[model samples]
Target: DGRYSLTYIYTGLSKHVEDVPAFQALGSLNDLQFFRYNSKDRKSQPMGLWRQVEGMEDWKQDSQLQKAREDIFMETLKDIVEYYKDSTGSHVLQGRFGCEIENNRSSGAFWKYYYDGKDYIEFNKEIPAWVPFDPAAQITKQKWEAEPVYVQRAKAYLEEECPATLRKYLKYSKNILDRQDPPSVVVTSHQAPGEKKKLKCLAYDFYPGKIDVHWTRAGEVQEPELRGDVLHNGNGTYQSWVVVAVPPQDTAPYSCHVQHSSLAQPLVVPWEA
Candidate 1:
């Protein structure tokens, strides 16, 4: 019995944005990205964990599939722009398709679309149709519903094909799928704009994305009044920080505490400033 997942996210823009491409896609296992494709890319390039498991044929096939999705995303985005009579910035299309398994069985599967960060439509296997969530989505939903096989195709992929692929991929890369890298803890201070001194307890280079960083004073654990969400470092690791205001040139028995699955015990690091 094992847990596995495979997800593909597509985000495209009719207008060019910096760094991120006008059209881009990423293939991820759970939260870890294994490959990416963009308008400027000719192929779905492998990255991170998948980089070690080499294969030329997969990239070729992936490129072909991703290009088709690219065109589909572009055309749909253009239709929305025309319907709304708006610029590309106001209309962005995002799609997510994936399946997850638990105890060797599918726990859930999903195929959903969003526009401007709002739900537009979602594939429902019960009706085997694309259910529209907005007026603009009705146009595409009707077209997709008219053709029954398209729904069936999406149905099989989410319920069957996706799970099988996840299992095989998991078998191909075991440790890449299961590794716990501990975070390196540090405490630093900076002067603020209003003579406010702040102490930061930063936990960096941790794997699996979940971490608890908090401040403590005189053995009393302070609630995370100021904290940041765990963020990917783009190298299969994560970072997060918790901050608290301290007095100017303050000397307090303040300590930073970190709890993570990778560590056998909670890390207790003190700050003497």
Candidate 2:
């Protein structure tokens, strides 16, 4: 007798496997690199931490099953690599895998490939058909400016602490329905320290929901004493604004930091006051 397993391809890590129901659960995959971050919806959950397993009858022994696994494994691997290669300057090289799905008892064994960083095989593993390493695979060749170490560390820490699965669902609900909180601060008129004059500024639209507003001086975060956050835009993309009243100094730099679930990273806009 043969048992059944399932295969699924999600474009981003934001998608949760548990949301899908097919066979008992997802078996192993060979190439892990196919996984990616769903930029539209990033959650605070880790990806590829576990593979679901369930007992099945003698499912591995079937030649058909074996072939199916191999075919998908190869196809997904090539598709993912090609997608990144074609994207050019924005390719983020990650990992891949070659997985096996088999039932020790009742069933036989089948081959599959997974592409997480762990499954990386030499490019020659495929023989005669060499899949070229990503042109920018080497860090030195990457185009993006080097991110500060702390920023990089913070991003990774956030990824591990708040993986993408939960974040995706939140965006679906918060964004699609227009329930997101607006920006906390509305920038009106401002002043620079030592100038001894108040600059004329105006606050346009203010948005609602949960949001915070803060002021920063000379690139350092600072608290504004008379800060007010309001949600004025109820429909469409929610918007918010903040106002900061400071001494009229010409050389001081002022900035606003906006935090929201809709954003993968916090929003910071700065200007010379």
Candidate 3:
């Protein structure tokens, strides 16, 4: 209801909002300023803003808005699914709709819609040709075509009608915290009676999320056979792992080197196999 409206639409019902008991408490709160779900901590944190709004206690329980939003989403998903079924003769198992808006010079409004994790349709200025030639696709395209007009109108309204609140939201988003947490690395090995030895290095609970993890044999860097993507610990931290297969007899001092922004120097942990 302010300068920008952020709406995320996913194919299935969100487990965080529906299934998770830890998040159930948020279902009733309307004063939620910001909320974050910490997967590692296994909890949801909802904070109230310093500025309070009168008569907004039941904002979260606004059934009219909720029903309308849900109806629109369900109808859209149903239509898209039917379109795919009729055109490609296959069902779209999953879908996603993302939208964003900002008032800055480099920012405007845009949306992207995906089916089965693939880009199905995208809108910024014009509709692309890849979109299917159907009535449902045309309607979806038109919905996104009107987004930029709404954004520009809202930006003008904010400047003329509510400059103070707009400035506050902008300032809050620009503030940054400077703390960085270093990672804890653990190295382990596995072996079978006749299988090749495998060494694994795990680095967890790191901030800034960007870190380098690799193996070195006798001070010479070697490419690992397996590497995992850096994943969110969900507490504003991340974790990653790398594994290398080594010959049982060749033990030339294998070690894992980790480089992160928080560390003054890189941390190297030797493998004891």
Candidate 4:
């Protein structure tokens, strides 16, 4: 029911050297790379190449690589769009491309084209074959004939270019993991003369960016009516909140439970009247 989609990822890693502090320090130097490609309403178009270099502040765009990728993508995208258009005699606008690699091995690479969000054409780099489903069966032969070229290109990038980049920037070191900090929890409530009370549980200043927040009323777990997505505080911490509605006449003590990896057990904070 839609157009084609494609995504590709490339990865490289340096070989482990020794347990020396200098080598271990290199581990903290950062050194990661990733990218995404979407066929419909491109979310990462124009300048989407992202990379993290050792000793860098944060993930940054690779403008040169981004432009080069965009050029190749636009060319390939135009071809696939036209191919489907000619076969269906209608404009198609849905597809995705995704790829990932690690330790010089291709993790995954695939392209999917859709019609109305249903599978139209699919290809996996691992299998290196084309699978056409539903109304797209009519063009299966054409797609099968055309898919190999792109599949070969993907394989070439993984086998040839990926290794070269890995060797070029390889810096191996001993593994070290960072410790996480527990979040600070705050529970508050508000009510008006003629409205239901709004109870909120706010959790902030947590590391690792993952936490769970829920409400409990009278010792029974109660689901929150509203919950916010985890938000970054821009200082290596995170914040999130959950809200539940309470009746004005309710007198049961409510509590907010927050669970994080840093905590041995969940932290419970009681709401005040």
Q: Best by lDDT, which number?
A: 1
- Which prediction has more favorable TM-score, 2 or 4? 4
In candidate 4, stretches whose alpha carbon ends up further than 4 angstroms from where it belongs are: 1-61, 80-95, 98-109, 113-122, 126-152, 158-181, 205-210, 223-225, 231-238
Residue range 1-273, candidate 3, lDDT tens digits: 223432233343222243432111112111112333222233434333312323322444433344444445446656776665553343332332222235532223334555545665653333222253345567666664466565454344333333343334344533111236789999999886788988899999776567999999999998888998564422445788899889868969999999999999999999976
Candidate 1 TM-score versus the reference: 0.78
User: What is the C-alpha lDDT profile of model 2 across 175-209, one tens digit per residue?
Assistant: 22233343433445644555443322222232224
Model 2 C-alpha lDDT versus the unseen true structure: 0.35
Candidate 2, TM-score vs. the true structure?
A: 0.27
Residue 208, candidate 4: Cα error in Å is 5.0
TM-score of each: 0.78, 0.27, 0.55, 0.54
Question: Looking at candidate 1, what is the lDDT of residue 108?
Answer: 88
What is candidate 1's lDDT per residue for 1-273, written digit by digit as tens?
Answer: 667788989998778757768888988887778888998865788887677786422888889988998998888888878878877355579999988988878888899999888998999987777888979898887766677688898788888888888888877767666778899999998886887778889999887777788899777787765888564625777888998887666565999999998999999999876
For candidate 1, the per-residue lDDT at 87 reads 73
The Cα error of candidate 1 at residue 121, in Å, is 2.8
Tell me, by TM-score, which candidate is best. 1
Ranking of all predicted structures according to TM-score, beginning with the best and ending with the worst? 1, 3, 4, 2
* Least well predicted 10-residue stretch by lDDT in candidate 4: 20-29
RMSD, candidate 4, Å: 12.7
- Each prediction's Cα lDDT score? 0.82, 0.35, 0.53, 0.53
